[PDB]
A paper describes a structure:
The RAS family of oncogenic proteins is important as therapy targets because of the frequency of activating mutations in almost all major cancers. All family members function by signal transduction to the nucleus of cells via interaction with effectors (such as RAF, RALGDS, and PI3K) that catalyze phosphorylation of downstream proteins. When KRAS is bound to GDP, the protein is in the inactive state and becomes activated by nucleotide exchange from GDP to GTP. Mutant RAS proteins remain in the active state and hydrolyze GTP at a much slower rate than wild-type (WT) RAS.
As a comparison with the KRAS169Q61H crystals, we also determined crystal structures of WT KRAS188, mutant KRAS188G12V, and KRAS188G12D (all isoform 4B) with a GTP analog (GppNHp), using crystallization conditions similar to those described previously for full-length KRAS188G12D.
Residue numbers in the entry: 1 to 172
Write the structure that this text describes.
């Protein structure tokens, strides 16, 4: 049953761990417990295929460029998370994407842009700027809330679909 290695990247506090824990354990972690590196394995069926998701939940700011290069080299595709009330988190996406491209020596890497915390009224990142950026990069954009579970399964399942597409492309 095909294995997909998914890496959740983004600035600190955007809800990378909350999103992942909603997917794997079906509840919302209210506390902020900063991550070092966590990994999860999970069995799912997407489009009729049984997938083993190996998900790496990364740190917000890493104490080693080597740890970062390591997860960028391993990952088959990347959930690029920002929080809709954190402009710098959104701005950081470009920088994560650049480093991923450079680490893999490739211009086409499977990725989904995730605007988390869509439940908050405190928005500083507009859905159009995010849609524009994704459109530029040629990747899907999904708005999510780890608190309500809105879009959570959509985000990870879409990333799997992106990986499947990339493999089909790389062979053609
Ligand atoms: N309102 C709301 N809060 C959220 C959402 N997702 C995460 N949070 C909250 O934001 C805080 C940080 O979440 P967390 O998942 O730990 O962020 P992280 O991106 O994993 N942080 P780090 O990079 O340090 O590990 C927590 O208090 C959490 O409850 C969401 O969709 N909505
Ligand atoms: Mg975390
Ligand atoms: Mg980070």
């Amino acid at each position: 049953s095909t294995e997909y290695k998914l890496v959740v990247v983004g600035a600190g506090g955007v809800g990378k761990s909350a999103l992942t824990i909603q997917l794997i354990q079906n509840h919302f972690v209210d506390e902020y417990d900063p991550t070092i590196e966590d990994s999860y394995r999970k069995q799912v069926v997407i489009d009729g295929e049984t997938c083993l998701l190996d998900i790496l939940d990364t740190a917000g700011q890493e104490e080693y460029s080597a740890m970062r290069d390591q997860y960028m080299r391993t990952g088959e595709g990347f959930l690029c998370v920002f929080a809709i009330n954190n402009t710098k988190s959104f701005e950081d996406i470009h920088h994560y994407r650049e480093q991923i491209k450079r680490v893999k020596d490739s211009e086409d890497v499977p990725m989904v842009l995730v605007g988390n915390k869509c439940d908050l009224p405190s928005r500083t990142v507009d859905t159009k700027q995010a849609q524009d950026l994704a459109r530029s990069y040629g990747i899907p954009f999904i708005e999510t809330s780890a608190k309500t579970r809105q879009g959570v399964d959509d985000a990870f399942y879409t990333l799997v679909r992106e990986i499947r597409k990339h493999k089909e492309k790389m062979s053609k």
